[PDB]
Symmetry: C5
Subunit: 334 residues, 5 copies
């Protein structure tokens, strides 16, 4: 009620405070409990092999130098006072670019409790690196992790734990990913040994399953239809050389344009993927159809009966071979 | 008139002022009234699912520690004095990259009133996230919101309201979006409960309706014309096998090129859209036209009468079926 | 020449100086005279609807607190002293991202005069928004403005004027825009009334006119040539059905590819422009040519004389109709 | 060797030092000698009309206030001391975005000398604007300059010179430009008069010559080959009307695709270029070949002798006219 | 255990500490031992000729002014204390844009030892320049280096060495590059003489070998198949002029589209590469095939026997010549 008394108490708390020394310096490690409230997952980039994530990151510890008595309330202080306290050197092991939002003020919260407990919250947009195995793309399932670690203090100076157990991370169910669906999320706590000692480590893992409907409608169906159109030339009479030659070579041209424009639209991932295998299979099928017609045209004059036999065998074989190829592809990648 | 007297008054106001404590700390919550003057909406991006917004954001509160007497004027102070006062920890819940303009100085205004009232203005360019339902794109109607919330203080320490009621937000009528048109805007005030307590929340919602003339001219009309050209082969005499094969396969090639280049130009939206369904329908129609010609050519030799009957039935059916498809499409999505 | 005396004078000037109070606080408004030296105009973006401008922006005013005697020279101080003086809160109304150059030092200049006059110069690069009416693109004329206003002070506290009258802006003649030409520039001074009062406003307007030679050589000539090639099929004998079908459908394919690649290369402007109308007109012309040939081929067998009459009428009509279309287009848009 | 004595000497030097006043304030101008060690030229952009340049920029002047005695050594101080010293307000006239590297510390060097001489080095990555005349692109020769000027001080307060004469700028020979070769570089020193007085100016000019092999292999040879393939139709007998029509129209289509995709790959420059003229010439040649074939096909029935004469004249003329066009092109632009 | 005693000791250490003077100023050079722990290599860019590298950079030196007694423990201090100590002016000679991570705090570590030893850790994401020889692309092998040098201090003031010998740099084996493979890494230490004297230099070099499977699947196989299709016209009977003309010209069109789209997808590298040579070889082969067919068609009427002889000679020559071309290409570059 008396603002002067509160100011006196806060000044007494910050008088003689040393920000260069951790709580219980030279004593037991200070336990820091962390919770994450995930606001959104902005994007998942395969080209950059990373993902953007916005979250409310809250740390909870206890500095007895900040214990105050006579005020039966929790002091929610201005965020600028965070520049005058000790805060954990928490960082994100696999991030590439992170920042704290600073509009209208720096998105930061300091709340002190009578027993010296400090709650310290930030709003962070971090671009965390996520190595992806795109061999089964676009039927792939990825696993992206956020790693949280102390930078300077070892496990003899600091310890990390998830505050609230498995309920430490919230907001996962509200994440809207246009292309993925979050199958599961896991929380792990452990210690990692490096040349400078043992460091606490927290891990938050998401498992994402890609949605395939867009690719099915826009990447496979045109190729299937072009392959069927390539088959069409089998029923065309072989006397009309121009018609069948034009049909085959134009199907080849359409397949090439489809492949090039899909490769332009699809992310630039320099190795073999499932969709690339399917496109190569379709291209090989149309190439074989054109080559078969060329052979039929060449051997037609010598023996037209054998030409007709080869034509009907192609009619009965090419759809069957393509059905087998599709069955193998959709059973190997599913 | 006496600048020395005014300097003395300001120094007296700022002497003993604790910026770490909110006004009336430990008492009733401080009421903050907010108004927004929207300068422009820079862009709306479906790829990033966001919109850029430049605005003048003004907050109004009362701090009795700043009440001054003897000066019958409102003191417009230099913006730098804002670093020596308590300001609310207002932030935008759904933004992604917000900044305050800083040329030639930080675009910030502090005005003090004799009764302790503070007016605090900022010029903010915020890129706010907006989830978009693009199932009906480009005939879609989006709803994009700006959420305003206190970061640290709860409803026991701060309260938000729209100063001026429904006239708090201005400049909406002057917004010039090249692709959208603001149908309506709304103001909402409420409280949101989180694990740390109840927080005030203001919401500014816009409803945007997309313009369709560009898409009609540049995306649908070419497809309709190519479909009509595909029908053209029905009136061509069947004996000219080369001409009909060339026409059908070249219509297919044009349709594929159109689809690929539109997909390249269209925003990267990894799910089915209405325009995609329409393009797939046109592609299926030209594919069926080519298949029908193939069937006619195959059965022409055995019984030309049946071939002619199929040709005339195709002439009478394909325009009819395409008209039905267009009617269904333009009644479902409108 | 005695640097100790000058240091004493400057320290006396800055001793007791209050940066939070404008000159003549509580008295007459302080007049600020502004001059702009435009170094360059970097770019004019149609997609983003803005232009980038680099300029030496200089503000001239009088602060009697800074008047000094005994030194018959103008004191060009280090720019850092600007952090210890009151400066106008000048900002740009329509800018989107401005910055002050800071290599090797902050590109800032402070000069003091014996009568208390302050000259304050900055080197600023600003991306100012400019809504463009691209209906007549690429034959359009744009009017892009830079607006200058006081953020916090009203006309009761500050007044703006163009120092030097019509010669307050220089370097316009030296601007090298590869695509536009600066027809004219104008200086406007006025006052703008908002809910918080009246504010001074300066406006510098440029009238840019686009150059059309590149569009003529790259965007219209290919379409005209493809239309002529479509006309070519008229003189081809109707017996060669395959030849005319291939010519017409391949002209259609070339027109589609040209349109798609031009749309990819042209700025993404989501509404109809003149060039789009021209491309659609050419597309309709080639479509009608193919339809006419189809009708001729259909009616050739029943009555070849009527088919030949239609063919020669097409030969005499299509160039004439295209000439009329071009005349209407080039007189409506010029 | 006695660090306390050196610290005392430095403190005495900085005691009473006024950074707001230049050396010899009110007296003769302070001469600043500059040298540049060019680390690399990162890129040269025609689209943005600029070039990125990383360099070690060193300034050399004398400040008698910093003269020290008793230490016969050059004091290489920590870079932060530069914040406590007067440094020239040197800036780059034509830069767009410059920064000083700051990892692991700000790349800045202060070296004091017994006679008061100060050496001040920075590592700067500057994006300098360069207007390019791309009429003769890609056979062009550009001249790109870096301008160095004093922002606030005139020639009465400061003077510039290249320290070391023509050897002031080093590292030019080690520059590896993938697309350009540095023919020459020049150093210029002068004075430029603006409305505020005369300012010293240094200029460093490079003359860049573009490599042509990539364009010859990738831009001209395909066009020449497509033109030759267009000529191929002349030797084809006119009885096969479909074959010649297909050949001509497909050569036209290939030319259109080549032009559009080259324009996509070529930098976005909105005016005429030499490569554009060459592509238009090739397009006109193939267009005229198709027109000639159409005329031959039209007049073939009435009088085959004249048709064959026109065909052989085309055979003997088209290569000759194309050779003349290439000779004119390669003599005018070289 | 006594925090007051530790605070007293630290304050005593920093009392009278001059950060402007290196350790042992005026005496022997201070030896700085460095170790790098590489976290990941983000990307390797052929367009920009640079690679992004994230690492933990640790420096080790001895400052006797920081030696403390009575505390038999190492002091891991808050990173902010790094602003109150001397640190080496280490920078990266070839970087273009580097930063130290700053979430949640600045990613920085200071550890002090009783004998005056300082360990200084940073987390740095640097984009280092790497000039690449893309003549043998995509069969190329690259050598990319990270250079480390002192900015202001010469070898008389500071010396660099790798702390740990060849084990100083760790994490190389765990680097995951999708496109490259790290063959070897080398650590070099030396001294480099500039005009201002000799500076210490450390170098960390990587040798990277590009993976070729993606290019074999998606860049070479389509060209080989298109060349084979161009051959297939040889077996087509030469009486069918339209079919062979269509096949040859459409193979040319597909080759052009493949080349243009690959050039668009491939990095912008404006000089000759191996893949460009292969594509030009395939283009020349299909062009020669079309020319040979044209010659056969021209000479067919005068003497069909010679035409058939040329046809069969082409059948036996073109595959052999292409096999020789492939053998030369794949033996020269491998
Ligand atoms: C994405 O991929 C990552 C790996 O790259 C997966 O992360 C792994 O997740 C599993 C759990 O699903 C982790 O396994 C667990 O590790 C715990 C920590 O081990 C450390 O600490 C213990 C002491 O507490 C030490 O003994 C140990 O040596 C380590 O130092 C263990 O405590 C867990 O054990 C518990 O469960 C097992 C059964 O699983 C029982 O047998 C045990 O008794 C005990 O109850 C467990 O082993 C694994 O460590 C994680 N790896 C990494 C590298 O972090 C993600 O799960 C994946 N994404 C998704 C969504 O799954
Ligand atoms: C884009 O989409 C969003 C939703 O995603 C829309 O936002 C909703 O807008 C509606 C109004 O159109 C909001 O409904 C209103 O909420 C007010 C607040 O209620 C809260 O606070 C009160 C106390 O003040 C509590 O009692 C209550 O439980 C809530 O916690 C109400 O005060 C409003 O009441 C009005 O209607 C009721 C009848 O429904 C009457 O009885 C009242 O007298 C009064 O007239 C109303 O219910 C809704 O809350 C918004 N949702 C969210 C999540 O914010 C946007 O409107 C939409 N964009 C556009 C342009 O429409
Ligand atoms: C790009 O488009 C903008 C508009 O969006 C154009 O800006 C307008 O420019 C014209 C001049 O070309 C401006 O007109 C002038 O306004 C002055 C200011 O008027 C205010 O202040 C006066 C008092 O000083 C009040 O009376 C008045 O109500 C306003 O509050 C006037 O002083 C000018 O009057 C003088 O000239 C006119 C003739 O032009 C004479 O008849 C008068 O007697 C007098 O001599 C004049 O009216 C206009 O205000 C600008 N509008 C805006 C919104 O800024 C740009 O010109 C255009 N770009 C280019 C290159 O033209
Ligand atoms: C890229 O393009 C730029 C221009 O945009 C070229 O820069 C020009 O370079 C030439 C030299 O090659 C410069 O010409 C020289 O200017 C010197 C300075 O003149 C000023 O100072 C003198 C007094 O010292 C005044 O009299 C004069 O009015 C100026 O105020 C002169 O001193 C030079 O004269 C000397 O050389 C000439 C021969 O070159 C002799 O005839 C003289 O007797 C004397 O010895 C000379 O005139 C020119 O100023 C530069 N222009 C600009 C705008 O800076 C670059 O060279 C070009 N890039 C490349 C690679 O060439
Ligand atoms: C990418 O490309 C760079 C070059 O651009 C390669 O870097 C070179 O690496 C080699 C080693 O592979 C270096 O060669 C060695 O240099 C050492 C340092 O020499 C300097 O310092 C000494 C004093 O210590 C001076 O006398 C000397 O003049 C230099 O200033 C030498 O000490 C080494 O010699 C030792 O080994 C050789 C055998 O290898 C013995 O014959 C000698 O007697 C002695 O024992 C050796 O010469 C070379 O300096 C590096 N050059 C540069 C510019 O850095 C990278 O290796 C390459 N990347 C990869 C992965 O290989
Ligand atoms: C509030 O506390 C201060 C400091 O103890 C004291 O001086 C002041 O009198 C108190 N206020 C009241 C109303 O007692
Ligand atoms: C202006 O105020 C100062 C400070 O209160 C005072 O000393 C001075 O006398 C005042 N001026 C006048 C004219 O009263
Ligand atoms: C310079 O001015 C100072 C302050 O007035 C004075 O103490 C000093 O003696 C002057 N120097 C000379 C040379 O007059
Ligand atoms: C801790 O150190 C301080 C400062 O030296 C001293 O005053 C205090 O007595 C010490 N604590 C104990 C328990 O001795
Ligand atoms: N070069 C001194 C600053 C300047 C030039 N032009 C206008 N202001
Ligand atoms: Cl932000
Ligand atoms: Cl800005
Ligand atoms: Cl800058
Ligand atoms: Cl940097
Ligand atoms: Cl970061």
């Amino acid at each position: 009620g008396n603002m002067s008394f509160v100011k006196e108490t806060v000044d007494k708390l910050l008088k003689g405070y040393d920000i260069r020394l951790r709580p219980d310096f030279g004593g037991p490690p200070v336990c820091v409990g962390m919770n994450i409230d995930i606001a959104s997952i902005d994007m998942v980039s395969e080209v950059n092999m990373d993902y953007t994530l916005t979250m409310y990151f809250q740390q909870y510890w206890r500095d007895k130098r900040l214990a105050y008595s006579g005020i039966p309330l929790n002091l929610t202080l201005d965020n600028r006072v965070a520049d005058q306290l000790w805060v954990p050197d928490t960082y994100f092991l696999n991030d590439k670019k992170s920042f704290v939002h600073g509009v209208t003020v720096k998105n930061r919260m300091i709340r002190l409790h009578p027993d010296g407990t400090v709650l310290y919250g930030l709003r962070i947009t971090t671009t965390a690196a996520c190595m992806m195995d795109l061999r089964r793309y676009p039927l792939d399932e990825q696993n992206c992790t956020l790693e949280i670690e102390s930078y300077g203090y070892t496990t003899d100076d600091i310890e990390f734990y998830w505050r609230g157990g498995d309920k430490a991370v919230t907001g996962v169910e509200r994440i809207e990913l246009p292309q993925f669906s979050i199958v599961e999320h896991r929380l792990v706590s452990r210690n990692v040994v490096f040349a400078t000692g043992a460091y606490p480590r927290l891990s938050l893992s998401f498992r994402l399953k890609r949605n395939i409907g867009y690719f099915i409608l826009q990447t496979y169906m045109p190729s299937i239809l072009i392959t069927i159109l390539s088959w069409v030339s089998f029923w065309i009479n072989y006397d009309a050389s121009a018609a069948r030659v034009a049909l085959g070579i134009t199907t080849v041209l359409t397949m090439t344009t489809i492949n090039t424009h899909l490769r332009e639209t699809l992310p630039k991932i320099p190795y073999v993927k499932a969709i690339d295998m399917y496109l190569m299979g379709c291209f090989v099928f149309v190439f074989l159809a054109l080559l078969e017609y060329a052979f039929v045209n060449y051997i037609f004059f010598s023996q037209p009966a054998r030409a007709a036999a080869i034509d009907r065998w192609s009619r009965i074989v090419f759809p069957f071979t393509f059905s087998l190829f599709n069955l193998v592809y959709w059973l190997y990648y599913v």
